[PDB]
Amino acid sequence: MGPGFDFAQAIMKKNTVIARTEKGEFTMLGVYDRVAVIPTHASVGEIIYINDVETRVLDACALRDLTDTNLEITIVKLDRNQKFRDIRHFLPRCEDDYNDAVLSVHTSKFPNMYIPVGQVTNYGFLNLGGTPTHRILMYNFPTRAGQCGGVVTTTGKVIGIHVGGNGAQGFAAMLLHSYFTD
Numbered sequence: 001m002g003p004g005f006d007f008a009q010a011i012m013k014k015n016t017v018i019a020r021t022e023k024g025e026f027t028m029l030g031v032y033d034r035v036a037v038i039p040t041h042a043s044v045g046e047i048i049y050i051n052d053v054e055t056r057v058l059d060a061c062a063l064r065d066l067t068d069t070n071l072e073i074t075i076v077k078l079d080r081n082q083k084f085r086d087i088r089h090f091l092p093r094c095e096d097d098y099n100d101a102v103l104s105v106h107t108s109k110f111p112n113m114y115i116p117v118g119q120v121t122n123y124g125f126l127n128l129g130g131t132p133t134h135r136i137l138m139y140n141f142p143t144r145a146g147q148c149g150g151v152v153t154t155t156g157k158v159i160g161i162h163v164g165g166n167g168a169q170g171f172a173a174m175l176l177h178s179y180f181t182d
């Protein structure tokens, strides 16, 4: 409906796939080459389904900060025959607060779904499902089961992936440029 949704749609159409693990279906953001991200609670194994195709996982890393605290981001390299468009120049370099963000989801359950979530706080520490987690962004939207992996964007920036909620607020793990230096 506006430039926020326009940027969000451009990322969804070219840089997302539907990832299925034994823990469910997730929006998965492709970042560059065959490298993608997914919330760590997806429990990626040796084989993942990508758009319902059986796919070998060439490598997977659950990120933690230098305090050895969970960040809830898993970086996955996929044995896929096609590269993602490189979107690393849209990733923020530093932890920050944001105005006017969109959370975008694409699964069997929620196809072509775009939620304007408004202001995004750099929340920092969150006990997420019992697990101490750092670099959490928070938005005041009642997000629901099925939105995990959803992409958070502002005009011009891809800032996080949805990892939880408490019924009133939603929480995303930051994406930072430094995660994807090759």
Ligand SMILES: O=C(Nc1ccccc1)N1CCCC1
Pocket: 142, 143, 144
């Ligand atoms: O599931 C939803 N809405 C919704 C709300 C918040 C997050 C995700 C989805 N709907 C079912 C029919 C009316 C709308």
